[PDB]
Amino acid sequence: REIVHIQAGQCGNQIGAKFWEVISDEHGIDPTGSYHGDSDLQLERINVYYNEATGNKYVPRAILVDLEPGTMDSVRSGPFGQIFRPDNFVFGQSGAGNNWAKGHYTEGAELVDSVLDVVRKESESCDCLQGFQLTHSLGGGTGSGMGTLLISKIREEYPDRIMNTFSVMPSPKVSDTVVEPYNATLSVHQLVENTDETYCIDNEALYDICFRTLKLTTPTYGDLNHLVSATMSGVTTCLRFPGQLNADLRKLAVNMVPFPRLHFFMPGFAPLTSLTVPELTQQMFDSKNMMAACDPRHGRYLTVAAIFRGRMSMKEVDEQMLNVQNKNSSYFVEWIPNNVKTAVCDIPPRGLKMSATFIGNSTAIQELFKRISEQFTAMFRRKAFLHWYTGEGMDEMEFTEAESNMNDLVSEYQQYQDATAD
Amino acid sequence: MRECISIHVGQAGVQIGNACWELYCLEHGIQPDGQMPSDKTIGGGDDSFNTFFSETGAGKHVPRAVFVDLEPTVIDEVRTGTYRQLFHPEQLITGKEDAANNYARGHYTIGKEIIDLVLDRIRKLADQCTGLQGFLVFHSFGGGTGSGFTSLLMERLSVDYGKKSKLEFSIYPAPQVSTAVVEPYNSILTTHTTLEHSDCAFMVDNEAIYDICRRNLDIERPTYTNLNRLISQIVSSITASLRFDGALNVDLTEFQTNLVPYPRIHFPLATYAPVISAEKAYHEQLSVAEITNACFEPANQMVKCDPRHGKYMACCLLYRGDVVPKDVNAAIATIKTKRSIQFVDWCPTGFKVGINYQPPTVVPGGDLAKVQRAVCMLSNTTAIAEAWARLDHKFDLMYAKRAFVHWYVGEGMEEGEFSEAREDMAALEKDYEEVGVDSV
Amino acid sequence: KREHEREVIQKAIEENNNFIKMAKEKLAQKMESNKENREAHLAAMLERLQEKDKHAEEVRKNKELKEEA
Amino acid sequence: XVXXX
Ligand SMILES: Nc1nc2c(ncn2[C@@H]2O[C@H](COP(=O)(O)OP(=O)(O)OP(=O)(O)O)[C@@H](O)[C@H]2O)c(=O)[nH]1
Ligand SMILES: Nc1nc2c(ncn2[C@@H]2O[C@H](COP(=O)(O)OP(=O)(O)O)[C@@H](O)[C@H]2O)c(=O)[nH]1
Numbered sequence A: 001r002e003i004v005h006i007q008a009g010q011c012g013n014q015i016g017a018k019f020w021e022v023i024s025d026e027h028g029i030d031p032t033g034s035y036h037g038d039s040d041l042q043l044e045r046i047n048v049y050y051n052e053a054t055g056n057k058y059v060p061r062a063i064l065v066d067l068e069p070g071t072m073d074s075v076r077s078g079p080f081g082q083i084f085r086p087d088n089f090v091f092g093q094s095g096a097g098n099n100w101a102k103g104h105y106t107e108g109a110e111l112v113d114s115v116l117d118v119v120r121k122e123s124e125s126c127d128c129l130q131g132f133q134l135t136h137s138l139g140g141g142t143g144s145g146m147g148t149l150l151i152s153k154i155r156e157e158y159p160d161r162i163m164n165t166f167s168v169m170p171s172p173k174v175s176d177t178v179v180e181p182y183n184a185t186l187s188v189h190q191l192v193e194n195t196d197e198t199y200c201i202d203n204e205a206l207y208d209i210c211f212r213t214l215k216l217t218t219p220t221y222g223d224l225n226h227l228v229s230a231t232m233s234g235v236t237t238c239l240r241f242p243g244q245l246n247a248d249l250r251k252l253a254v255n256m257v258p259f260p261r262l263h264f265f266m267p268g269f270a271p272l273t274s275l276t277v278p279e280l281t282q283q284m285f286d287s288k289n290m291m292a293a294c295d296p297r298h299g300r301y302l303t304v305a306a307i308f309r310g311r312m313s314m315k316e317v318d319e320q321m322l323n324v325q326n327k328n329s330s331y332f333v334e335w336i337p338n339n340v341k342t343a344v345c346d347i348p349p350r351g352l353k354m355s356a357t358f359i360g361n362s363t364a365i366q367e368l369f370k371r372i373s374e375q376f377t378a379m380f381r382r383k384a385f386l387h388w389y390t391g392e393g394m395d396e397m398e399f400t401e402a403e404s405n406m407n408d409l410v411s412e413y414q415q416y417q418d419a420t421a422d
Numbered sequence B: 001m002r003e004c005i006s007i008h009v010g011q012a013g014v015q016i017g018n019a020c021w022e023l024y025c026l027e028h029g030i031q032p033d034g035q036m037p038s039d040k041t042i043g044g045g046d047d048s049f050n051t052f053f054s055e056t057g058a059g060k061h062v063p064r065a066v067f068v069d070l071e072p073t074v075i076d077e078v079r080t081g082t083y084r085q086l087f088h089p090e091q092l093i094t095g096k097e098d099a100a101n102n103y104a105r106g107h108y109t110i111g112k113e114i115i116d117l118v119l120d121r122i123r124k125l126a127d128q129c130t131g132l133q134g135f136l137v138f139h140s141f142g143g144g145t146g147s148g149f150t151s152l153l154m155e156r157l158s159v160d161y162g163k164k165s166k167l168e169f170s171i172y173p174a175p176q177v178s179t180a181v182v183e184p185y186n187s188i189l190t191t192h193t194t195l196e197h198s199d200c201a202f203m204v205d206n207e208a209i210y211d212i213c214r215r216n217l218d219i220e221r222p223t224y225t226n227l228n229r230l231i232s233q234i235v236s237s238i239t240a241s242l243r244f245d246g247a248l249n250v251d252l253t254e255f256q257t258n259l260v261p262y263p264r265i266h267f268p269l270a271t272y273a274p275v276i277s278a279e280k281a282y283h284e285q286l287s288v289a290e291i292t293n294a295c296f297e298p299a300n301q302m303v304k305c306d307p308r309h310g311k312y313m314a315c316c317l318l319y320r321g322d323v324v325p326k327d328v329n330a331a332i333a334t335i336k337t338k339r340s341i342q343f344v345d346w347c348p349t350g351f352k353v354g355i356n357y358q359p360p361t362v363v364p365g366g367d368l369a370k371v372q373r374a375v376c377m378l379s380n381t382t383a384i385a386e387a388w389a390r391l392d393h394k395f396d397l398m399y400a401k402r403a404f405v406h407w408y409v410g411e412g413m414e415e416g417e418f419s420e421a422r423e424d425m426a427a428l429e430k431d432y433e434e435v436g437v438d439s440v
Numbered sequence C: 001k002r003e004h005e006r007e008v009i010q011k012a013i014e015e016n017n018n019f020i021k022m023a024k025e026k027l028a029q030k031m032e033s034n035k036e037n038r039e040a041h042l043a044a045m046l047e048r049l050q051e052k053d054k055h056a057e058e059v060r061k062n063k064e065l066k067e068e069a
Numbered sequence D: 001x002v003x004x005x
């Protein structure tokens, strides 16, 4: 039933804020927290993301976190800043100079106990808590370092609940920060062990989409985020409206994660203009529309979830989804029959008349981790910048463990990509 | 006397339960508020419809049923639906968190939290019976509740009721409307666990029903409401002998005697006719001879098997409506001539026939034409084993790589329980092969 | 014939009783084996997260030396 | 074979 949301850090609170901006509109929730919608399908499963405060006020079951206050006052001063429960704002001061260690062990640990207090306040209220979803970046320090801390702290208190994450992978094409290949490899080391399902948001992909496809001369962060929000609203449609397929976080994981470690998803969206059903289908399976910088045709799909939103012919969707599987039969592993599922939601997303959201667990995702590992080992073979971490009391072995563990994940993806039937 | 308690487990079980009890009500002239103007026996009765319906002082006719689900959404719609007044609240039992398409959760983690309550409510219904005949259990093969909890309940029912009959209506998974990738797993597990606890199980292949809806009713993309309304007609045919009675009526237990040659060979193939639209049925009336022929057309089968490539071990015909012995006898004579229909050498070749003069009714806004006469054939053919085979192959492909197995182990199951279940299925396919062989 | 007529009906009880017995047992065994297996899986999960909590201290207690020198 | 007093 209920999901508890947690946004952490600069990137985390930005994408987190936009996410609420968007779905609040879909459910007809204004910045004050009142309902002014037409359809009753909107309030059918509103409880999943909203608490019903006194005076029929809908309040995002969300927790905002950071080590600098600079991003969070922008949120509270933002269009929807007042919709949030002001108590759920939990920000430090000492900050984190994009140091993963400060977020995880040092600067984040004094604040971790205060965040967890807020989680318990929201969790105790849940009729039936299904789990948590997190928004954060893996290049920074707070969202990356402290986010992974928070996951671990929450897990040992809610070990039978689902842990979901919208993790933003760093790319040089968006940030000149040099230590990002370190922050990511360190957090990924945590994600493989402590999250049940992880949506990979790749900045290299978000930029390339914006520049190449959207022809944005100079893409802003808000431009990238407009893609992220469209994606997040897409992959959570089944969670938020009365439906059949993947209606909760657990049923999604059961359908999407064949092996506990390989739970890193390649989300896709169409149309990416920012329009027919056969066109939507082909697009959402195309390399260009992938929100992770990976060619799926360089690997095989383990599992796939497709969500078609808007008023369209369900026969057509069925015929087309069978079309793409038949024609691209080679790119779906034989040893998992019927690995592709399809949802259809009547309510189109704001602006569009119909959209298609894609979610794929592909072994082609290994392309994304390899890029980070090349950026990682190039700096680490020389022991560069390690003083920022060891200074915080860390150990150089913990880097190797993080390195080798991340390399194992890639092998595991290649293993099942090369597997055969009989 | 000879009461029958229905148990509807999980979404499929419940929703099919809605269609069935709605239809039953229309067949017996029972209003959605339970009142039945026909029945003059107030507060009690010995009539045929009393095997499925109890009576109250208020003159209210109450289904001898229980709806169980580990999550409230589906049953909630019943509680608030058109036939809300028909039931007593204690008959509608909901959890909070479902089994997440996980057999383990349905049988253990979540199921154990509610099994006692369900049995307590089942028990309370049994106490209303002057002579309980047994239970009918509606469930899906693919769901976590439909598979896991059903097995748990059936095991518990064997203990609490010994060897009173337990019949299944099992929804066999189809890709066109599958909700989980692991439905093959759940299927093999529930089938194995329930096998020695079920006396007779009618498998409903969704792909078959999907096909029939598309072909015979010209439904573009069939919904659950579409499939259920067709399924209900078939269930109604099978239970007609229990709910009505006439001179030509043959009790379902008599059919059961012919259909089950060995305790494990208890999966009859259902084939129903006529499935026809109102447009096609207009000005075109189907004879006893015509519908009888359809029963041997695999397009009308409820499971996708090929009886031609298999051998017959029994043939029952459950007629209802405008059917006379004369026409039936002549109809089967034709088929004895116009088909070949091979039987195993150890079985006789007669067809056990039953007739209920009460004609088929149809639900309003329904897709099916209202016909004067209809028939359901129950056959025990080796071809049904094809259903196990397709499912066992799907199972084999995933377990070979232990795909998804971790979701099951995490809830407490073992790999041994998997290989064990799979071995039983291998034995069952082998059994269904053994019976087909000729004697020496 | 009378002696046999009793042997038969008592054999039917004994077999139907034993079916109830086996079922009751096979169920109780696999329901207990399940409880143990799940509790164990949760125990090992909590174990790993608690050794990360003492590794986290060995980091906070490694820096606490470096600072003071 | 269907056969009623
Ligand atoms: N014919 C028919 N099949 C259904 C219906 N509802 C679900 N199914 C089938 O049931 C299977 C999934 O099992 P469900 O019954 O939905 O799941 P459940 O019993 O509620 O168990 P959990 O939700 O996992 O706890 C799918 O293969 C569906 O095709 C229905 O109303 N009619
Ligand atoms: N898409 C997107 N990425 C961001 C945003 N802000 C930061 N990032 C990415 O996050 C990384 C830096 O982490 P950051 O969030 O600034 O560190 P924090 O202070 O710990 O939250 C860089 O690789 C950026 O590309 C944003 O608003 N949108």
Ligand SMILES: [Mg+2]
Binding pocket: B010, B011, B071, B098, B143, B145
């Ligand atoms: Mg369900």
Ligand SMILES: [Mg+2]
Binding pocket: B039, B040, B041, B042, B044, B045, B046, B047, B050, B055
């Ligand atoms: Mg009466």
